[PDB]
């Protein structure tokens, strides 16, 4: 016959929004470790009732680059880092519009800079009311793909606060296997990301061993006796080939520049360990790798005058501690883009990452924040008296 | 539904599932038959949420008012549907498009329906007076 | 009623007493016409109670929803009584068995009534569609 | 309206203004699309207000119950007006006597209206039974 409308309440329909979310973060509120200091001051001890009420046959495109929840975590972290980390003398730049003399005059900013500590907190993200944080048990997606056997949460899972480049420390791991994240193969900047389904050992020790500080008118010299690993890189290459089929697989070019994009740059003693492109960056893949063959060696050392991943401009940290440091880790994956172009003939090379908005997005492809739209419309044969 | 609210179904469960978990949420909550010196602030932040829950809860649970079914959990409106809007029948409807991927199909009529609904509410007011114009 | 809630009567007062103190609670709240450094924590604990009051308040004051009279304070259902349940008439009913000792007399139909009540709600939904199947 | 509540108009704006800002409060909140060691106590005192807001909110937003439109924001009663009460028509009414100076004109019928309103509610209950005395 004819068709008429109904509308009703509460019928889980969670269209998009990406608003503020609150943390769930069990600090100690006692340890001087600034991680927990922030995790309690501006963050809150944990939520004990998360209910992953698993989805049925959803089809939702957990597009991992339209999730401003990730930007929100980003800005939360940038908020964390600065009362966390104390730059002695920050030389940040500025100009005020004057068409070409835009007054880019170096703004020096002095402060006080002692040490505290560094130890991540798996924080979690918590939708506001009427909002639901869709998760994803599938992780593949090609980058953009749903998940059958996941659903909502109340607060999220642990997403820690350490930052590093192409390779993390003390951080997440990968759930099922190694998958990748990108799109079109015409020009290919489109940074690719892998989550590596095993762990790896990275450990740097330096008790004193170098009492003599300078060389001329070494303590900053750090030797990272690590491991050996390689087979995870074989899984690396086999994946790469599964997406780069007919070509071999190199890296072949770490051009350089600002140290933080190329070198393994990771946070320990508040500072980082900066070496060249000599290590583990080399092998080619036609059906074999190209390297060789406990804590043996790899030479990544510390600097002091760093750049910020946060806002452009330098920073000037403190002289280090006498020695006896160590940091372990559990690599979740890696950060890579083809060193591509059009000069190339049938060898293929991947090459590097320094944008956090993905550095903490190999952990949030699942999380899609939504409101509720619990008012719903549908057809019936419902109409009133005349 | 991940929170004090959204409590009439589970995600991924398609429509019919949530629609019926309505009544069982009812029937399941019907009978009822370390603490740190700065746990203060967590309790505090814990507070808002619940209030805001009720607040929003009402805030449009209220303004189901002009929609003629405030307070409750289940409307049935009185409007003629536009097959141009979804053109689907309860069978696939309730069993498919696990709502989150349901309403995006109609992400635009979001306010046209509020339009027609408050419109028919005023329609009822008009007929009430027409009917009362004699006795 | 000893608390922010239970506010529609006094204990020992039999039914009719509480039932009528309903309206006078209404009419009585209608017009409206030392502090220690750790009093903090008492205020704190004082807080919950009031929230939880509203929370439960709604929580089924809400789920009077499926019972067709949420929000309000007084239902009248639409079900046929089972003399097997109490077999009493308003006279002794309201004047005796000061409720606390009233409902124990029917401590078992506690959910049979919710049964029949939500059942008649769905009955109404069914008749609404029967009636709308033509116009 | 200076607070979480009184949210259906602005002072000095006469009646029609506030009456219509009702629906736009609805439509505006529909889509949604230093900290000192003793900031504790301010948050604390900040708390009450919001609760009490909901509390009073309901507390008679509730007892619009016996008034037959609890929960909602807009009644229409069913009583015969006494021109002895205001003797004004919507034109000047809504456009003048910016309410604060409106109701003082009727500062006395404040409870006579509640009288007649709950009275007509009981009138409805009486007619419901009259009508049901046969079927
Ligand atoms: C290129 O790749 C395909 C598989 O995609 C393979 O069958 C083919 O043999 C390759 N080309 C050559 C020259 O082997
Ligand atoms: C809905 O259908 C009616 C007639 O069936 C028509 O008058 C109206 O314009 C339609 N509305 C939309 C939005 O399609
Ligand atoms: C729309 O509904 C009509 C109803 O007769 C049906 O014939 C048609 O196939 C439907 N089309 C789509 C695209 O749903
Ligand atoms: C829901 O969709 C699936 C696949 O599209 C189909 O097999 C199933 O029959 C649909 N449900 C209904 C009730 O038609
Ligand atoms: C969705 O598919 C699953 C597959 O097991 C099935 O159990 C379920 O019934 C389907 N959804 C609905 C609403 O039936
Ligand atoms: C339906 O909603 C979508 C949501 O983006 C919108 O793009 C589209 O224009 C709407 N339909 C029409 C006919 O405009
Ligand atoms: C309780 O007993 C007293 C006797 O002093 C009587 O006045 C009162 O009416 C009784 N309560 C009820 C509810 O009848
Ligand atoms: C309740 O009463 C109805 C009719 O009066 C009867 O059919 C039903 O069996 C009764 N149930 C009980 C439990 O007495
Ligand atoms: C039960 O109800 C009947 C109704 O006729 C009445 O006669 C009888 O006294 C009642 N018995 C009991 C035990 O309440
Ligand atoms: C209440 O019970 C007492 C004795 O238990 C009796 O005297 C009284 O009449 C009863 N109430 C009514 C209204 O009959
Ligand atoms: C009524 O409730 C009591 C509760 O103890 C129970 O023992 C009794 O069996 C119930 N009535 C019937 C007829 O079972
Ligand atoms: C109050 O007077 C102003 C003139 O300053 C006028 O704009 C406004 O309309 C008046 N208020 C109302 C509610 O009309
Ligand atoms: C109110 O009006 C009714 C009839 O319109 C009349 O019977 C009654 O006396 C009036 N009362 C007052 C106070 O004006
Ligand atoms: C009172 O109402 C009558 C009704 O016709 C009207 O003529 C008269 O002007 C009104 N007087 C006042 C003071 O409102
Ligand atoms: C309100 O009063 C003013 C002055 O008395 C007048 O100009 C205005 O027209 C009145 N409002 C209406 C709707 O007549
Ligand atoms: C109307 O209210 C005023 C308020 O001051 C009061 O003085 C007056 O007596 C009331 N009207 C009548 C007729 O009593």
SS (H, E, C) chain C: CCCCCCCCCCCCCCHHHHHHHHHHHHHHCCCCCCCCCCHHHHHHHHHHHHHHHHHHHHHHHHHCCCCCCCCCCCCCCCCCCCCCCCCCCHHHHHHCCCCHHHHHHHCCCHHHHHHHHHHHHHHHHHHHHHHHCCC
| Per-residue tokens: A245 | 């089929």
Question: Shortest CA distance to D13 belongs to which of D99, D74, D89, D88?
Answer: D99
For this experimental structure, what is the resolution in angstroms?
3.6
Residues facing A193 on adjacent strands: A335
DSSP state of A159: B
Hey, are the CB atoms on D32 and A41 less than 8 Å from each other?
no
**Ligand 15 centroid distance, CA of B126 (Å):** 28
DSSP state of A132: E
Cβ-Cβ contacts under 8 Å between B and D: the total is: 38
D14 C-beta closer than 6 A to ligand 12: yes
Hey, are the CB atoms on C26 and D54 less than 8 Å from each other?
no
**Ligand 14 centroid distance, CA of C116 (Å):** 54
Question: Shortest CA distance to A3 belongs to which of C41, D78, B77?
Answer: B77
Q: Which residues of D fall within a CB distance of 8 Å from B54?
A: 54
Q: Is the distance from CB of A268 to CB of A302 less than 8 angstroms? A: no
Nearest CA to CA, how far is B81 from chain A (Å)? 4
B89 C-beta closer than 6 A to ligand 3: no
| Per-residue tokens: D96 | 């003048």
Q: How crowded is residue D59: how many other Cβ atoms within 10 Å of its Cβ?
A: 16
Residues facing A91 on adjacent strands: A108
Q: Give Cβ neighbours of residue A43 (< 8 Å, ≥ 6 apart).
A: A23, A24, A25, A27, A121, A123
Question: Shortest CA distance to B19 belongs to which of B84, B98, B106?
Answer: B98
Q: Over the range A164-194, which residues count as b (16 or more CB within 10 Å of their CB) and which as e? A: bbbbbbbbbbbeeebbbbbeeeeeeeebbbb
D34 C-beta closer than 6 A to ligand 16: no
CA distances from B74 to A130, B3, C113 (A): 17, 19, 21
Give the Cα separation of A290 and D22 in Å (integer).
73
Q: Which residues of A fall within a CB distance of 8 Å from D33?
A: 17, 371
Hey, are the CB atoms on A381 and C133 less than 8 Å from each other?
yes
Using DSSP, state whether B112 is helix, strand or coil: helix
Touching partners of C (3+ C-beta pairs < 8 Å): A, B, D
Nearest CA to CA, how far is D105 from chain C (Å)? 17
Residues with their C more than 2.5 Å from the N of the next written residue in chain A, i.e. before a break, are: 100, 217, 228, 293, 351
Hey, are the CB atoms on B31 and C111 less than 8 Å from each other?
yes
- Please, what sign has the CA dihedral across residues D13, D16, D17, D18? positive
Element (H, E) at D16: helix D15-28
Question: Shortest CA distance to D65 belongs to which of A303, C2, C74, B86?
Answer: C74
Question: Shortest CA distance to B29 belongs to which of C59, C73, C108?
Answer: C59
Touching partners of D (3+ C-beta pairs < 8 Å): A, B, C
Q: Which residue has the tokens 């203004």?
A: D17
Q: Which residue has the tokens 């007006």?
A: D81
CA distances from D103 to D86, D96, D110 (A): 9, 12, 9
Using DSSP, state whether A215 is helix, strand or coil: coil
Nearest CA to CA, how far is D26 from chain B (Å)? 7
Instruction: Give the count of alpha carbons within 13 A of A64, CB side only.
Output: 28
Gyration radius of chain A over CA positions: 24
**How was this model experimentally determined?**
cryo-EM
D93 C-beta closer than 6 A to ligand 12: no
Minimum CA distance residue for ligand 1 atom 11: A246
- Give the phi and the psi of residue C28 in degrees, each rounded to 5: -90, -30
If contacts are CB pairs under 8 Å, which of residues 24-53 in chain B contact chain A? 36, 38-39, 41-42, 45-46, 49, 52-53
D101 C-beta closer than 6 A to ligand 15: no
Hey, are the CB atoms on B7 and A385 less than 8 Å from each other?
no
**Ligand 2 centroid distance, CA of B84 (Å):** 8
Give the Cα separation of B113 and B99 in Å (integer).
17
Q: Which residue has the tokens 């350089």?
A: A256
D38 C-beta closer than 6 A to ligand 16: no
CA distances from D49 to A82, D64, D119 (A): 35, 22, 34
């Amino acid at each position: 016959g004819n068709l008429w409308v109904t509308v009703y309440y509460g019928v889980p329909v969670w269209k998009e929004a990406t608003t503020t979310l609150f943390c769930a973060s069990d600090a100690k509120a006692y340890d001087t470790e600034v991680h927990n200091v922030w995790a309690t001051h501006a963050c809150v001890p944990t939520d004990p009732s998360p209910q992953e009420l698993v989805l049925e046959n959803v089809t939702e495109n957990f597009n991992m680059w339209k999730n401003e929840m990730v930007n929100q975590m980003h800005e939360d972290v940038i908020s964390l880092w600065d009362q966390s980390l104390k730059p002695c003398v920050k030389l940040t730049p500025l100009c005020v519009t004057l068409e070409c003399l835009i007054n880019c005059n170096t703004s020096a900013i002095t402060q006080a800079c002692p040490k505290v500590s560094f130890e991540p907190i798996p924080i979690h993200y918590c939708t506001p009311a009427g909002y639901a944080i869709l998760k994803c048990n599938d992780k593949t997606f090609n980058g953009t793909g749903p998940c059958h056997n996941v659903s909502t949460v109340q607060c999220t899972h642990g997403i820690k606060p350490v930052v590093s480049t192409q390779l993390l420390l003390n951080g997440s791991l990968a759930e099922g296997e190694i998958i990748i994240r990108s799109e079109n193969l015409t020009n290919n900047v489109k940074t690719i990301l892998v989550h590596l389904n095993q762990s790896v050992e990275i450990v740097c020790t330096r008790p004193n061993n170098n009492t003599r500080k300078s060389i001329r008118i070494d303590i900053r010299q750090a030797h990272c006796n690590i491991s050996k690993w390689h087979e995870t890189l074989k899984r690396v290459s086999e994946k790469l080939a599964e997406h780069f089929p007919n070509k071999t697989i190199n890296f072949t070019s770490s051009s350089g520049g600002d140290l933080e994009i190329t070198t393994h740059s990771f946070t320990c003693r508040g500072e980082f360990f900066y070496c060249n492109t000599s290590g583990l960056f080399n092998s080619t893949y036609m059906p074999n790798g190209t390297y060789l063959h406990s804590s043996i060696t790899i030479p990544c050392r510390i600097k002091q005058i760093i750049n910020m991943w946060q806002e452009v401009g330098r920073a000037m940290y403190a002289p280090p501690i006498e020695g006896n440091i160590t940091c372990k880790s559990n690599i979740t994956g890696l950060l890579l883009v083809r060193d591509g172009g059009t000069e190339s003939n049938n060898t293929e090379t991947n090459n590097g990452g320094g944008d956090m908005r993905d550095n903490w997005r190999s952990e949030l492809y699942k999380y899609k924040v939504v409101e509720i739209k619990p008012l719903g419309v549908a057809p019936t044969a419902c109409k009133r008296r005349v | 539904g991940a929170v004090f609210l959204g409590f009439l179904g589970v995600a991924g469960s398609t429509m019919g599932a949530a629609s019926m978990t309505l009544t069982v949420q009812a029937r399941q909550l019907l009978s009822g038959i370390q603490h740190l010196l700065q746990l203060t602030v967590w309790g505090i932040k814990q507070l808002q949420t619940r209030v805001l829950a009720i607040e929003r809860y009402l805030k449009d649970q209220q303004l189901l008012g002009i929609w003629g079914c405030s307070g409750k959990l289940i409307c049935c409106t009185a409007v003629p549907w536009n097959s141009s809007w979804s053109n689907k029948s309860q069978k696939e409807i309730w069993d498919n498009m696990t709502w989150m991927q349901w309403d995006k199909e109609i992400s635009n009529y979001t306010n046209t329906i509020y339009k027609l609904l408050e419109d028919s509410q005023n329609q009822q007011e008009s007929n009430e007076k027409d009917l009362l114009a004699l006795d």
